[PDB]
Amino acid sequence: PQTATKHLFVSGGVASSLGKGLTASSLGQLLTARGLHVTMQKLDPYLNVDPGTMNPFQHGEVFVTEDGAETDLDVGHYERFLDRNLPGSANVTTGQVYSTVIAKERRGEYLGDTVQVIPHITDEIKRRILAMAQPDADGNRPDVVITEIGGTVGDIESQPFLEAARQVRHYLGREDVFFLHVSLVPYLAPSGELKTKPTQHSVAALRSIGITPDALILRCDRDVPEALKNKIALMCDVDIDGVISTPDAPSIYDIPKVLHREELDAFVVRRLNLPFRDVDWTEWDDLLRRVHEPHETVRIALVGKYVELSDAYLSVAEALRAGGFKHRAKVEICWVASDGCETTSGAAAALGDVHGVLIPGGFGIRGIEGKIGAIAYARARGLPVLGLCLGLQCIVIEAARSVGLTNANSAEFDPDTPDPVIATMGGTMRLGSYPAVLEPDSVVAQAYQTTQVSERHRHRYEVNNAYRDKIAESGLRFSGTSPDGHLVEFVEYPPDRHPFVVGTQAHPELKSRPTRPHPLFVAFVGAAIDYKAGE
Amino acid sequence: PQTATKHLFVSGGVASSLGKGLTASSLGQLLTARGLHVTMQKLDPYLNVDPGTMNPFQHGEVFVTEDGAETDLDVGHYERFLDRNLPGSANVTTGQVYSTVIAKERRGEYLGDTVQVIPHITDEIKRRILAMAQPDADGNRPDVVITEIGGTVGDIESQPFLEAARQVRHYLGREDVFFLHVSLVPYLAPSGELKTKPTQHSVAALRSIGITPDALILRCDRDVPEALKNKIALMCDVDIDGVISTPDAPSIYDIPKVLHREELDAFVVRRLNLPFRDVDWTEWDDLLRRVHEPHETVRIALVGKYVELSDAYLSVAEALRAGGFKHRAKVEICWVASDGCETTSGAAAALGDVHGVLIPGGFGIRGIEGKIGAIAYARARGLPVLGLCLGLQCIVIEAARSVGLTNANSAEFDPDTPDPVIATMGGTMRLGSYPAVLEPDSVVAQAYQTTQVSERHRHRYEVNNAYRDKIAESGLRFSGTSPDGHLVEFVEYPPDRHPFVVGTQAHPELKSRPTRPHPLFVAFVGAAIDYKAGE
Amino acid sequence: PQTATKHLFVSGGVASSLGKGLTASSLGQLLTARGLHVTMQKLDPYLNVDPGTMNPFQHGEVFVTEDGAETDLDVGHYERFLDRNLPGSANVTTGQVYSTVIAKERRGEYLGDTVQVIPHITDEIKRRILAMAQPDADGNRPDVVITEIGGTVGDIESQPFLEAARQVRHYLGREDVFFLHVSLVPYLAPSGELKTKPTQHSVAALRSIGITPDALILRCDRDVPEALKNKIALMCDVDIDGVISTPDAPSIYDIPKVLHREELDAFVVRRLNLPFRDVDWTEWDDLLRRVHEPHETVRIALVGKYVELSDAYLSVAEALRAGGFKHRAKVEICWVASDGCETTSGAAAALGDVHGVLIPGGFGIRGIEGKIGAIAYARARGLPVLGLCLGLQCIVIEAARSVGLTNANSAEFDPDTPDPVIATMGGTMRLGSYPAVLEPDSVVAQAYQTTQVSERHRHRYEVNNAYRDKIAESGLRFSGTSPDGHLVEFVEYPPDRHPFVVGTQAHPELKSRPTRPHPLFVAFVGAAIDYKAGE
Ligand SMILES: O=c1ccn([C@@H]2O[C@H](COP(=O)(O)OP(=O)(O)OP(=O)(O)O)[C@@H](O)[C@H]2O)c(=O)[nH]1
Ligand SMILES: O=c1ccn([C@@H]2O[C@H](COP(=O)(O)OP(=O)(O)OP(=O)(O)O)[C@@H](O)[C@H]2O)c(=O)[nH]1
Ligand SMILES: O=c1ccn([C@@H]2O[C@H](COP(=O)(O)OP(=O)(O)OP(=O)(O)O)[C@@H](O)[C@H]2O)c(=O)[nH]1
Ligand SMILES: O=c1ccn([C@@H]2O[C@H](COP(=O)(O)OP(=O)(O)OP(=O)(O)O)[C@@H](O)[C@H]2O)c(=O)[nH]1
Ligand SMILES: O=c1ccn([C@@H]2O[C@H](COP(=O)(O)OP(=O)(O)OP(=O)(O)O)[C@@H](O)[C@H]2O)c(=O)[nH]1
Ligand SMILES: O=c1ccn([C@@H]2O[C@H](COP(=O)(O)OP(=O)(O)OP(=O)(O)O)[C@@H](O)[C@H]2O)c(=O)[nH]1
Ligand SMILES: [Mg+2]
Ligand SMILES: [Mg+2]
Ligand SMILES: [Mg+2]
Ligand SMILES: [Mg+2]
Ligand SMILES: [Mg+2]
Ligand SMILES: [Mg+2]
């Protein structure tokens, strides 16, 4: 029989930006490779109910789950390292917790009580942590739930989360709950020494709020010597086997090997009394060979509205690299500001030396003339094109304009357009997984190797069906639709006209994993390798 | 010219229930008696947006301000000690702050930002503290704003409030901001010693979150000796003149004298560089003579739905005592459960030895047959009656039933009544101050000594005007109405039928002060003294 | 009239090794250059009563003051940056404080009291801090006492010192006491960001023990941007003018310019209400030109017993560089292990490419055959030699052996020597300043430009006077003695035999300053420049 679901909390000390999320994901990968059913959850101390109101060009992309929740980009790291679909419950924010509790209070659901941080707010957080241990849709209960606590220990914002995690430990006991604390071991260049004092003080602050760490992640720019690990084991009263030297890794994919060398995952398995099995390194060693030993390089333009923050297109960038890994190729991303591609000379200067053009999503942006300009250039140049959501819409708009509908546009970007080739169906916001049926022998069906697929959506604008016959005059095919045929889901040009020009209303990058590249990104990068070889 | 408005923060350490609110109010009284314009504010760390969802029979009454806000009962203590009307802004809750910030976030008012505890929550609290320093309706800016911080220092719930108060100090400087910290000095009976260690540790916790106390309130069951005050001055680094021995007082009205003997108010005035003037003791010494030296006693029944928690009727109980003070009388409150007054024998057992019957408000209660039974008994017995809100409604229902409308009731308590003598005008919830016009020479006009008054309301049910002629058959007079005459505001019987049976739709107790008794409570207690003398 | 002596406490947070001592010294230099009388003191939390029991080859040199106290090497940094003689009271250790208090307790001096950390230990520390504000021998009372608190805030070992400093502030008031806190602002290379969180948490720990910092030293590997300084000013509630970006400097002599650019010294002067005067940069700008713009280079061997820790010979190394500065020369120190110089081929390999040989002191070492070997090589080679304490003794031993006393030695290193040319006078340990009278026209009198000098000693072995005539057969002159002529203080060879071979029983390096090079080191480096030019 399966033992109780274990809870492993990941907290951070000293300072943020130490990479707690990627350490947690890498531990999730190691435990998954040991045959454990691992799920992950992020507690975000921000008040935004969902990250949809945040500027993604400052704060990073919005990740969308199968069930349609808009979440912190960390859920994307979890899905990529676990190769698993996570529920919307995998991202809890202070905003969610407080508005749920306040809304219940206003309805009289606390029956005359004074509604308090303890127990009402901490009960809500605890409820959301414990919900992760419920059996999934297939009927499976996880072995381990890894919960990452955002914010830094000693700060005000994470106090209700840390209190809830302390109560989870109190109610489930030490056998079912593990605390992993991430700290910084700074190097002082004038004296040449590494310092353990910040970890010593951070662990005392963690202990002061009632939490005893079982293990410590020592984030450092170099190996932490055994003498320093011994000092930390003694001063922080942590088993020496739980004191983990975690030096900065060359790639994010190398972090599981760093943690495994320090035997963190074997310590976790023994401490939580989990079924023991050796790590099966087959899948991850294969990824690492594709990461560190590519056989060729290919340049891809990512034509984003704003490209100074790569995290705004993190899942797209990861899906492009994963497409490369499948071909044993290194994808070099050429970050191109879409505003520079509006004119033919601007698009030529920006895209003249690339091998493929990716037009990503642009939820909430204004001004798409640069994205349309990039597609017009790529079509004339013979460059492969992959359009995602706004990308498909731009492929459809450019096709309509190429056949005489000069002022064709989306009613989203030009409400006064005489030809709204993209329009609402107010309409309906489509979030999360939606099924699509593909034309057999189409470019998209050949890429997927099936005619029945599902992809995640985040949009309310659709191809206007009144324009299908007029748009098709360009040779553009509506090669994928909703099962009833009403909604256009995929577009493509015939391969005799353009070897690879594909659009999707969805975000296939979200279902990409470094160990499981998405079929559309594999076909796109493959077409980019073909273009390079032809040139 | 008037100097900058000063902010005086009152925090609590060691444990709650030490009486921070009454200490703050008493300091507000002392500063007011020095001719300073003082306003007060309570920061409540509970999530209830307003205390309307709290059971008042567990948590205490809801106070209503002139502008119609439903607030914590502490605002009532502030109004009573300051003799001033406070704005709805005088009560800030965590619930208010978080729902305001989350609602702004959902509307996109933070323009793409990550919404955080610091600065977004603390900016909202700071905004609400600084709003208290704005000029009032008459154009006057306060000299001092006393802000009471609910919760205890070292607890999670008060951390955003304490951080906001620390930022107020940072931005206004030490000259305009004063920190008063309330602590416990426990007595250990086996060793016979008072202990300063809890104050020492509480002040270190206060300092740890960035606040330096200017003065300390040492709450104790006896005088704190000079040697202990010297130890605290040294260990807490507080001026000895700011170390205040605050032993438990015999009455709440004695606390200003306790603080004045220790010269706390003179220390505050000097430390904040406020205009100096001696306390004018005329008004408070007069109150203390009425408190400690009554010339007679009078027994009043307070016929409440639930009477085990006196704080559920705090403003009523204070208004009854203030009515007594005006007559140099001691009002002994006989707390009577209304459910025991439904039958004539039950009402006789409960009210047979009282001199007056007060029927208070009952916002949100169910089952008023006991309150109607108490009025029927009091009318037959010749007992004075004062009804407040639900009290007037019960006087009107009992009058209607005494003239043949056997099933007369409020549609609130019996929706199926064939005679809804009390009904909505859904209707309109009337909150805060409303003007009333009184019949000249009526009992109510003679009590007020004017025909034009205003009182605070908290109700949506009104006297049904279709029943005025039928109800008047009992001899009941509609002696007070809204200015247009549409809404019944006051009822009374003629003095030749009952010497004092008065109802009001409002809560006059809220406008009562111990130094300014409300005219209706003065007339009611006076009628109770008359009944006692006649018996 | 002179205002009250000010106390400026320097504490450290986050981690040790940030350079608190050199920051404090540099501030002492800036205040001295403003015409203020500044004195400095180090509080060391170690239990060693004096650093004499510490291995200097692990922990650094022992500094000796004029009054003969053996102190932490930090006193040497203070003397060098202030150009002032400090009393033995300038170094307080936990060992000193506890043994003084325990010794008084054992004698019954606390008259029946329970002897406690507070107040008995903290009174002793406070006494030692306040003693620094007493008028000196010349009758002058300092303007400022800078007290450096060793250990890190949040650690156990510095708690009594920090408590004493908090009591100094309590008793003298905020006008006479200033707190400077040194913190670390680490850089995280993967994200490219500087982090203020460790300073935020360190200042909260400092505040928690009752201390409010007036200013912060932000130790960093680069400039701290204004946005981070603004964040720290707000979160730590420190005046923005007191938030000091202190990036790692190229030389220790550049730190005053770093602090002056951030206007720390002008902030200190204004905050403590000290007489204001601009920094006179004449002397320090002159030093910086000699530091950064040398006209030539000269190589000097420092023939130490153990040379892997340069701090074991810090004052010697600084005196050598200061000798270089006087000649506008860069002294390159060739760290030579003395054990490798015992044989003529070993000494040739080690000293063949140098321009001068310095034989430093060796209090407590064993095995001096390598130092004697280095002197024998340097004499034959024509290399300049400067011997300090053990160095003079080695010059005397080598001279005695060169004239037939083959087994000549010190009774310290060979008790069985038939010729103890160096011996005790048990004897008398000579510590601190001793006067010497110099032979007019001798090498040493020409270097000093006077025949009457004083130097600091740390030794009990002396030249055995029974051997003066025999040693003089080598041509060695006893060119300096005690005033009564009994003790040999200086030795030298005639310039016609060796241009510069000088020994001193004292430690002249201790009286060296970078702005005031010692005459013997100036003459030694000058002789090394002469040797280089001749080669
Ligand atoms: O264990 C780790 C984690 C992270 N990293 C390195 O740090 C980089 C940043 O890692 P993250 O993307 O996880 O940083 P973050 O700002 O989200 O950190 P938190 O506040 O969540 O703690 C990564 O891209 C990688 O280069 C490591 O080398 N090792
Ligand atoms: O909680 C503690 C830990 C240590 N100490 C004291 O710290 C002193 C050593 O001071 P360090 O700064 O060298 O600390 P560390 O070695 O523990 O840490 P890192 O260098 O790795 O940053 C020792 O003299 C010990 O008494 C405390 O006083 N309290
Ligand atoms: O300074 C004071 C305050 C209070 N008291 C006595 O304490 C009683 C309770 O005083 P409170 O009604 O103010 O208690 P509380 O529970 O609201 O306390 P906080 O959490 O707000 O701190 C009062 O009725 C009076 O008897 C004093 O004697 N002196
Ligand atoms: O660490 C904590 C514990 C509790 N609380 C908050 O304390 C509030 C209750 O405040 P109390 O003063 O009543 O505390 P208590 O019941 O825990 O202790 P005693 O009366 O027995 O002295 C609750 O509203 C809860 O949110 C914190 O904010 N932080
Ligand atoms: O303000 C400063 C102080 C120091 N330093 C640089 O740091 C080096 C080490 O400076 P220290 O010799 O003062 O380090 P430390 O180990 O004694 O530190 P504490 O525990 O006393 O705090 C110095 O030689 C210089 O290179 C700076 O650049 N700036
Ligand atoms: O005491 C505090 C300070 C700040 N915060 C919270 O810290 C969050 C920002 O988290 P950071 O890690 O970015 O902190 P910082 O900007 O203050 O410091 P550095 O990056 O310079 O190291 C904000 O969301 C704020 O609510 C606390 O909760 N408590
Ligand atoms: Mg992260
Ligand atoms: Mg150390
Ligand atoms: Mg209270
Ligand atoms: Mg005691
Ligand atoms: Mg130092
Ligand atoms: Mg930050």
Short mmCIF file of all heavy atoms in Angstrom, two decimals, chain C residues 438-453 477 479-480 490 492-496 498-500 502 518-524:
data_model
loop_
_atom_site.label_atom_id
_atom_site.label_comp_id
_atom_site.label_asym_id
_atom_site.label_seq_id
_atom_site.Cartn_x
_atom_site.Cartn_y
_atom_site.Cartn_z
N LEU C 438 72.56 57.80 20.97
CA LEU C 438 73.27 57.35 19.78
C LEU C 438 74.60 58.01 19.67
O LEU C 438 74.74 59.17 20.02
CB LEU C 438 72.45 57.60 18.50
CG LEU C 438 70.95 57.22 18.54
CD1 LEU C 438 70.28 57.54 17.23
CD2 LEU C 438 70.76 55.71 18.84
N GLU C 439 75.58 57.27 19.15
CA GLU C 439 76.94 57.75 18.92
C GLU C 439 76.84 58.85 17.84
O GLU C 439 76.24 58.57 16.81
CB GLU C 439 77.80 56.53 18.50
CG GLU C 439 79.16 56.77 17.84
CD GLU C 439 79.71 55.58 17.05
OE1 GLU C 439 79.36 54.42 17.37
OE2 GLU C 439 80.47 55.82 16.08
N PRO C 440 77.30 60.11 18.06
CA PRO C 440 77.18 61.11 16.97
C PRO C 440 77.95 60.66 15.73
O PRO C 440 79.01 60.05 15.88
CB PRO C 440 77.77 62.40 17.58
CG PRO C 440 78.58 61.96 18.73
CD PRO C 440 78.02 60.66 19.23
N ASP C 441 77.42 60.93 14.52
CA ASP C 441 78.07 60.57 13.23
C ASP C 441 78.03 59.07 12.92
O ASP C 441 78.61 58.65 11.92
CB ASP C 441 79.53 61.07 13.13
CG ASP C 441 79.68 62.58 13.28
OD1 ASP C 441 78.75 63.31 12.88
OD2 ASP C 441 80.72 63.02 13.80
N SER C 442 77.30 58.28 13.72
CA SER C 442 77.08 56.87 13.43
C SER C 442 75.99 56.80 12.35
O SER C 442 75.29 57.79 12.14
CB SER C 442 76.64 56.14 14.69
OG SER C 442 75.39 56.65 15.11
N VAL C 443 75.84 55.64 11.67
CA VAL C 443 74.83 55.39 10.64
C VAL C 443 73.44 55.67 11.22
O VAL C 443 72.63 56.34 10.58
CB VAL C 443 74.92 53.94 10.06
CG1 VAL C 443 73.81 53.65 9.07
CG2 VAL C 443 76.29 53.69 9.42
N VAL C 444 73.18 55.15 12.44
CA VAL C 444 71.88 55.30 13.10
C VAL C 444 71.63 56.77 13.46
O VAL C 444 70.52 57.25 13.22
CB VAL C 444 71.65 54.33 14.30
CG1 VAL C 444 71.70 52.87 13.83
CG2 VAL C 444 72.68 54.54 15.41
N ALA C 445 72.65 57.53 13.96
CA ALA C 445 72.44 58.95 14.31
C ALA C 445 72.19 59.77 13.06
O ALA C 445 71.34 60.66 13.09
CB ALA C 445 73.62 59.52 15.08
N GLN C 446 72.88 59.45 11.95
CA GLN C 446 72.68 60.16 10.68
C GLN C 446 71.26 59.87 10.11
O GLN C 446 70.67 60.75 9.51
CB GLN C 446 73.76 59.79 9.66
CG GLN C 446 75.11 60.45 9.98
CD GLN C 446 76.24 60.02 9.08
OE1 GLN C 446 76.34 58.86 8.63
NE2 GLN C 446 77.17 60.93 8.84
N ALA C 447 70.72 58.66 10.33
CA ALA C 447 69.39 58.30 9.84
C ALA C 447 68.32 59.06 10.60
O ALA C 447 67.44 59.65 9.98
CB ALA C 447 69.17 56.79 9.97
N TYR C 448 68.41 59.07 11.94
CA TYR C 448 67.49 59.77 12.82
C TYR C 448 67.67 61.28 12.79
O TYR C 448 66.74 62.00 13.14
CB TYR C 448 67.69 59.29 14.25
CG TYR C 448 67.00 57.99 14.57
CD1 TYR C 448 67.71 56.80 14.66
CD2 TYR C 448 65.63 57.95 14.86
CE1 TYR C 448 67.10 55.61 15.06
CE2 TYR C 448 65.00 56.76 15.24
CZ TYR C 448 65.74 55.60 15.34
OH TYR C 448 65.16 54.42 15.75
N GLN C 449 68.88 61.75 12.45
CA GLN C 449 69.26 63.18 12.44
C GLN C 449 69.27 63.75 13.88
O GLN C 449 69.18 64.95 14.09
CB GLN C 449 68.37 64.00 11.51
CG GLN C 449 68.43 63.55 10.05
CD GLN C 449 67.60 64.42 9.14
OE1 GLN C 449 66.74 65.18 9.58
NE2 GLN C 449 67.82 64.31 7.84
N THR C 450 69.40 62.87 14.88
CA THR C 450 69.46 63.21 16.30
C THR C 450 70.24 62.11 17.03
O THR C 450 70.36 61.00 16.52
CB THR C 450 68.03 63.40 16.89
OG1 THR C 450 68.14 63.64 18.29
CG2 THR C 450 67.11 62.17 16.67
N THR C 451 70.73 62.41 18.23
CA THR C 451 71.46 61.42 19.04
C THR C 451 70.59 60.91 20.20
O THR C 451 71.06 60.11 20.99
CB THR C 451 72.77 62.05 19.58
OG1 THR C 451 72.42 63.17 20.40
CG2 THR C 451 73.71 62.49 18.46
N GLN C 452 69.34 61.39 20.31
CA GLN C 452 68.45 61.01 21.41
C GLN C 452 67.13 60.56 20.84
O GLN C 452 66.43 61.33 20.19
CB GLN C 452 68.28 62.16 22.41
CG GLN C 452 69.61 62.54 23.08
CD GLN C 452 69.49 63.60 24.14
OE1 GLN C 452 68.60 63.55 24.99
NE2 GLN C 452 70.43 64.54 24.15
N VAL C 453 66.82 59.27 21.03
CA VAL C 453 65.61 58.67 20.46
C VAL C 453 64.91 57.79 21.49
O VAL C 453 65.48 57.48 22.54
CB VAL C 453 65.98 57.84 19.17
CG1 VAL C 453 66.72 58.69 18.14
CG2 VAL C 453 66.77 56.57 19.50
N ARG C 477 79.85 48.04 15.54
CA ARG C 477 79.82 49.15 16.49
C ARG C 477 78.57 49.10 17.32
O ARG C 477 77.51 48.78 16.79
CB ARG C 477 79.86 50.50 15.74
CG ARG C 477 81.13 50.72 14.91
CD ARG C 477 81.16 52.10 14.29
NE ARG C 477 82.28 52.26 13.35
CZ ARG C 477 83.49 52.70 13.69
NH1 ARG C 477 83.76 53.04 14.94
NH2 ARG C 477 84.44 52.80 12.76
N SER C 479 76.49 51.38 18.41
CA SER C 479 76.24 52.79 18.10
C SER C 479 75.06 53.39 18.84
O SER C 479 74.87 54.59 18.78
CB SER C 479 76.05 52.98 16.60
OG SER C 479 75.00 52.17 16.11
N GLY C 480 74.30 52.58 19.56
CA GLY C 480 73.18 53.05 20.35
C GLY C 480 73.07 52.25 21.62
O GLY C 480 73.24 51.03 21.59
N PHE C 490 71.38 49.66 19.64
CA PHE C 490 71.61 49.68 18.20
C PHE C 490 72.99 49.17 17.90
O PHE C 490 73.92 49.38 18.69
CB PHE C 490 71.46 51.11 17.61
CG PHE C 490 70.06 51.71 17.68
CD1 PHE C 490 69.61 52.36 18.82
CD2 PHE C 490 69.22 51.68 16.57
CE1 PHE C 490 68.32 52.91 18.88
CE2 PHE C 490 67.93 52.24 16.62
CZ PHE C 490 67.49 52.86 17.78
N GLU C 492 75.67 48.54 14.22
CA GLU C 492 75.88 48.85 12.82
C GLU C 492 77.30 48.52 12.46
O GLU C 492 78.17 48.52 13.33
CB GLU C 492 75.59 50.34 12.54
CG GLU C 492 76.58 51.28 13.21
CD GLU C 492 76.29 52.75 13.12
OE1 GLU C 492 75.16 53.15 13.48
OE2 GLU C 492 77.19 53.51 12.69
N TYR C 493 77.55 48.29 11.18
CA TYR C 493 78.92 48.14 10.70
C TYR C 493 79.36 49.50 10.21
O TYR C 493 78.48 50.30 9.87
CB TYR C 493 79.03 47.09 9.59
CG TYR C 493 79.11 45.68 10.13
CD1 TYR C 493 77.97 44.90 10.27
CD2 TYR C 493 80.33 45.14 10.54
CE1 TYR C 493 78.04 43.58 10.72
CE2 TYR C 493 80.40 43.84 11.05
CZ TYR C 493 79.25 43.07 11.15
OH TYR C 493 79.29 41.79 11.64
N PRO C 494 80.69 49.81 10.17
CA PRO C 494 81.10 51.10 9.60
C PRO C 494 80.73 51.14 8.11
O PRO C 494 80.79 50.09 7.46
CB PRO C 494 82.63 51.12 9.80
CG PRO C 494 82.96 49.94 10.66
CD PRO C 494 81.85 48.96 10.51
N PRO C 495 80.34 52.31 7.55
CA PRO C 495 79.97 52.35 6.12
C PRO C 495 81.10 51.96 5.15
O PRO C 495 80.81 51.61 4.01
CB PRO C 495 79.57 53.82 5.89
CG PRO C 495 79.31 54.37 7.24
CD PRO C 495 80.21 53.64 8.18
N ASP C 496 82.38 52.00 5.60
CA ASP C 496 83.51 51.63 4.74
C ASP C 496 83.62 50.10 4.59
O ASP C 496 84.30 49.63 3.68
CB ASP C 496 84.84 52.24 5.24
CG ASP C 496 85.27 51.94 6.67
OD1 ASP C 496 84.84 50.90 7.22
OD2 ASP C 496 86.11 52.69 7.22
N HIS C 498 80.49 47.91 5.24
CA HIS C 498 79.17 47.57 4.69
C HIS C 498 78.39 48.87 4.62
O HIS C 498 78.28 49.54 5.66
CB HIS C 498 78.43 46.50 5.54
CG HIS C 498 79.19 45.21 5.73
ND1 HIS C 498 79.49 44.37 4.66
CD2 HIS C 498 79.70 44.67 6.86
CE1 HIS C 498 80.18 43.36 5.17
NE2 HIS C 498 80.33 43.49 6.49
N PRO C 499 77.86 49.29 3.45
CA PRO C 499 77.14 50.58 3.38
C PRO C 499 75.95 50.69 4.34
O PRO C 499 75.71 51.78 4.88
CB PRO C 499 76.68 50.66 1.93
CG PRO C 499 77.64 49.78 1.19
CD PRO C 499 77.90 48.64 2.13
N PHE C 500 75.23 49.59 4.60
CA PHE C 500 74.10 49.61 5.52
C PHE C 500 73.82 48.25 6.12
O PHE C 500 73.15 47.44 5.49
CB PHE C 500 72.82 50.15 4.86
CG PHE C 500 71.75 50.57 5.84
CD1 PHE C 500 71.70 51.88 6.32
CD2 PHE C 500 70.77 49.67 6.27
CE1 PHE C 500 70.72 52.26 7.23
CE2 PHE C 500 69.81 50.06 7.20
CZ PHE C 500 69.77 51.36 7.65
N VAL C 502 72.38 47.45 9.82
CA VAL C 502 71.94 48.04 11.08
C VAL C 502 71.01 47.09 11.80
O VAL C 502 70.14 46.50 11.18
CB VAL C 502 71.26 49.43 10.83
CG1 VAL C 502 70.57 49.97 12.09
CG2 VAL C 502 72.24 50.47 10.28
N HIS C 518 59.43 55.97 9.14
CA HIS C 518 60.39 55.93 10.23
C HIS C 518 61.79 56.18 9.64
O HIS C 518 62.10 55.59 8.60
CB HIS C 518 60.31 54.57 10.98
CG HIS C 518 61.18 54.53 12.19
ND1 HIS C 518 62.55 54.32 12.10
CD2 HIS C 518 60.86 54.76 13.48
CE1 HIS C 518 63.02 54.43 13.33
NE2 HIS C 518 62.03 54.68 14.20
N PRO C 519 62.64 57.03 10.28
CA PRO C 519 64.00 57.29 9.73
C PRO C 519 64.84 56.04 9.40
O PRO C 519 65.59 56.09 8.44
CB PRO C 519 64.68 58.07 10.85
CG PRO C 519 63.58 58.76 11.56
CD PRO C 519 62.40 57.82 11.51
N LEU C 520 64.75 54.96 10.20
CA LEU C 520 65.56 53.76 9.90
C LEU C 520 65.09 53.06 8.62
O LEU C 520 65.93 52.61 7.84
CB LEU C 520 65.57 52.76 11.06
CG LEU C 520 66.49 53.09 12.24
CD1 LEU C 520 66.38 52.01 13.29
CD2 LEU C 520 67.94 53.23 11.79
N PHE C 521 63.77 52.99 8.38
CA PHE C 521 63.23 52.37 7.16
C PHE C 521 63.49 53.24 5.94
O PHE C 521 63.70 52.70 4.86
CB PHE C 521 61.74 52.07 7.30
CG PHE C 521 61.50 50.88 8.19
CD1 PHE C 521 61.44 51.02 9.58
CD2 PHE C 521 61.35 49.61 7.65
CE1 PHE C 521 61.22 49.91 10.40
CE2 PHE C 521 61.09 48.50 8.47
CZ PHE C 521 61.05 48.66 9.84
N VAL C 522 63.51 54.58 6.10
CA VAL C 522 63.86 55.50 5.01
C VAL C 522 65.34 55.26 4.62
O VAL C 522 65.65 55.16 3.43
CB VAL C 522 63.61 56.99 5.42
CG1 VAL C 522 64.21 57.98 4.40
CG2 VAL C 522 62.12 57.24 5.63
N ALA C 523 66.24 55.17 5.62
CA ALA C 523 67.69 54.96 5.36
C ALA C 523 67.92 53.56 4.76
O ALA C 523 68.70 53.42 3.83
CB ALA C 523 68.50 55.14 6.63
N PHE C 524 67.18 52.55 5.25
CA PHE C 524 67.29 51.16 4.76
C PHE C 524 66.84 51.07 3.28
O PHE C 524 67.63 50.62 2.44
CB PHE C 524 66.48 50.20 5.64
CG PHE C 524 66.38 48.78 5.12
CD1 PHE C 524 67.53 48.03 4.85
CD2 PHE C 524 65.15 48.18 4.90
CE1 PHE C 524 67.44 46.72 4.37
CE2 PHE C 524 65.05 46.87 4.44
CZ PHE C 524 66.20 46.14 4.18
#
